[PDB]
Design a protein around this ligand. Structure first.
Ligand SMILES: *[C@@H]1O[C@H](CO[C@@H]2O[C@@H](C)[C@@H](O)[C@@H](O)[C@@H]2O)[C@@H](O[C@@H]2O[C@H](CO)[C@@H](O)[C@H](O)[C@H]2NC(C)=O)[C@H](O)[C@H]1NC(C)=O
Ligand SMILES: *[C@@H]1O[C@H](CO[C@@H]2O[C@@H](C)[C@@H](O)[C@@H](O)[C@@H]2O)[C@@H](O[C@@H]2O[C@H](CO)[C@@H](O)[C@H](O)[C@H]2NC(C)=O)[C@H](O)[C@H]1NC(C)=O
Ligand SMILES: *[C@@H]1O[C@H](CO)[C@@H](O)[C@H](O)[C@H]1NC(C)=O
Ligand SMILES: *[C@@H]1O[C@H](CO)[C@@H](O)[C@H](O)[C@H]1NC(C)=O
Ligand SMILES: [Cl-]
Length: 522
């Protein structure tokens, strides 16, 4: 099975999926390896090749630090790179239905990982199920992360910033120019990602350069207005310099880059952590910045004034977004016990999560979240909601409200099902990132999940697919709850779970008024 692309021929492999077949093209190059003098620069167009490129295995993941907090634990290790790390990592994957489709909708996945980690080869991002079940074409790409992908020196082409975002864009471009050859429809491309990947999707909605590279967007647990999604020019500058010093590269700013371009990836990765005086468990040392190229102004401004691609969006969050981060720094927390903490530990926890916040700012948080409705887990649960509400839920709801105010249909979901196979303890509930396997349809594979989860996954997959193809996330055949549009006034949203799916209104009303209106002032 050979497909001819604009840059050359590529060979794929046949896969057996649910008594059927899916054709996968794993590891297709989409840009010149960003090596040597190209390190830190925007992705360069790839050179036309001769012969057949064998896209039969996942390519190298981009250089990144790994989570070493729980060696041997699947809960954390499932997110670590499952492919060799390398600077030569600009590759993408394509899963197409078999027999070859004629004009299928294309789903392009953008993985999360705080812009510091991640890779498209993870088991939970396997797109062969979606290709099989919904007959859509699934594409995913590897983009540079950490300093290698976001080191910023605004205005300087040697390290302009947002390189990772531009890698993604170049991948979207590749789909535009090549997907037709795989039987895909370049006019029907839906982007979807989670966390930092969702924030990336939201930024593409704002970048004029990406406007004509996709049709619709899906944002799972993330958006650019999340406090961890955009690095300020001030912080970027101070971090670029701190990195320079830690590697003995302090100098002319262009000479600094030349210096850093002689350093080994390991030395650069090793010092990324200390660039920030007091970082938090979210740890976005090097992220998106207003570069004047990909992002022409502060995103908050563009959003507020309706400057973005006009189209439909599907947005959502998980019930317990914050828990996952409590075991990476919060005192009294552990994945090995019920983590019943005290008021004192809670207060210390806020310290960990809001390092540069005034003493009054932290008290305002405690005041809002401690008016107990006694229960030994009051503080444990409060800190999780605090982290979740502040970092994900409220920013996602605000993004949705603002985006829809400009006339486009928007759909919001509240994911509240805890995977029966979740390796983490129960007190962590419906964790951040664990709706992904349902979106990708892993529960459809009976070899593994309860019957209820197969049904829930099958439904979500259909809704996501209908949204991509028709801009409407409905499940029209099995007498399913209709998903109402999200509007600024009523603010209806759909709950996803195995029990009963409901239509609710104004998610976290009181909590978000706190984070969206008050807190930004402290
Ligand atoms: C901007 O960076 C400075 C410098 O950070 C220090 O040097 C870096 C190379 C790295 O090694 C960091 O871990 C160091 O902290 C920050 O200033 C530091 O502030 C802390 C406050 O706790 C102080 O203990 C350090 O001595 C200061 N560093 C020195 C020696 O000047 C500064 O806070 C950063 N600016 C921002 C964004 O707040
Ligand atoms: C839950 O565990 C935390 C973390 O303690 C570590 O992991 C435990 C499972 C066990 O292996 C301990 O020996 C480890 O130290 C406990 O928090 C610690 O509590 C002690 C005393 O309260 C304190 O001195 C430590 O600094 C704490 N560690 C941290 C990182 O905060 C916690 O007490 C346990 N919860 C329960 C079951 O009460
Ligand atoms: C690609 O696969 C073909 C046959 O499977 C093989 O002959 C060729 O050497 C491969 N190309 C490589 C390894 O670069
Ligand atoms: C795919 O559909 C588009 C409209 O969505 C149409 O313009 C295009 O010609 C189709 N591609 C094919 C099968 O030629
Ligand atoms: Cl239902």
């Amino acid at each position: 099975i050979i497909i001819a692309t604009k840059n050359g021929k590529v060979r794929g492999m046949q896969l057996t999926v649910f008594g059927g077949t899916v054709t996968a093209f794993l590891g297709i190059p989409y840009a010149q390896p960003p090596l040597g003098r190209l390190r830190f620069k925007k992705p360069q167009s790839l050179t036309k090749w001769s012969d057949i490129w064998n896209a039969t295995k996942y390519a190298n993941s981009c250089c990144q630090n790994i989570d070493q907090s729980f060696p041997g634990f699947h809960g954390s290790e499932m997110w670590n790179p499952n492919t060799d790390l390398s600077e030569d990592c600009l590759y993408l994957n394509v899963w197409i239905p078999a027999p070859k489709p004629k004009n299928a909708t294309v789903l392009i996945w953008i993985y999360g990982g705080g812009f510091q980690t991640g890779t498209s080869s993870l088991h939970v991002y396997d797109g062969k199920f979606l290709a099989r079940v919904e007959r859509v074409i699934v594409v995913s790409m590897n983009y540079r992360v950490g300093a290698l992908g976001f080191l910023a020196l605004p205005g300087n082409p040697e390290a302009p910033g947002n390189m990772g975002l531009f890698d993604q864009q170049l991948a979207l471009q590749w789909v535009q120019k090549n997907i037709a050859a795989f039987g895909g429809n370049p006019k029907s491309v839906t982007l979807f990602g989670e966390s930092a990947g969702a924030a990336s999707v939201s930024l593409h909605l704002l970048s004029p350069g990406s406007h004509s590279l996709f049709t619709r967007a899906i944002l799972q647990s993330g958006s650019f207005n999340a406090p961890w999604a955009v690095t300020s020019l001030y912080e970027a500058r101070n971090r670029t310099l701190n990195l320079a010093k830690l590697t003995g590269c302090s100098r002319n700013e262009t000479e600094i880059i030349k210096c850093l371009r002689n350093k080994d990836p390991q030395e650069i990765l090793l010092n990324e952590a200390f660039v920030v005086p007091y970082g938090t468990p979210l740890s976005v040392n090097f992220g998106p910045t207003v570069d004047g190229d990909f992002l022409t102004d502060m995103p908050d401004i563009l959003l507020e004034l309706g400057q973005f691609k006009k189209t439909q969006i599907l947005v959502g969050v998980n019930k317990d977004e914050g828990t996952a981060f409590l075991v990476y720094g919060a005192p009294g927390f552990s994945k090995d016990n019920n983590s019943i903490i005290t008021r004192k530990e809670f207060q210390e926890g806020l310290k960990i999560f809001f390092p540069g916040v005034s003493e009054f700012g932290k008290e305002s948080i405690l005041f809002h979240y401690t008016d107990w409705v006694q229960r030994p887990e009051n503080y444990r649960e409060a800190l999780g909601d605090v982290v979740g509400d502040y970092n994900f839920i409220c920013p996602a709801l605000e993004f949705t409200k603002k985006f829809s105010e400009w006339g486009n249909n928007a759909f919001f979901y509240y994911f509240e099902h805890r995977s029966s196979k979740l390796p983490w303890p129960e007190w962590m509930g419906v964790m951040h990132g664990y709706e992904i396997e349902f979106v990708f349809g892993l529960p459809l594979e009976r070899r593994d999940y309860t019957k209820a989860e197969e049904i829930l996954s099958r439904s979500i997959v259909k809704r996501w697919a209908n949204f991509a193809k028709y801009g409407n996330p409905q499940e029209t055949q099995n007498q399913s709850t209709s998903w109402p549009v999200f509007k600024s006034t009523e603010q209806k949203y759909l709950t996803l779970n195995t029990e009963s799916t409901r239509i609710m209104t104004k998610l976290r009303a009181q909590q978000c008024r706190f984070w969206t209106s008050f807190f930004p002032k402290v």
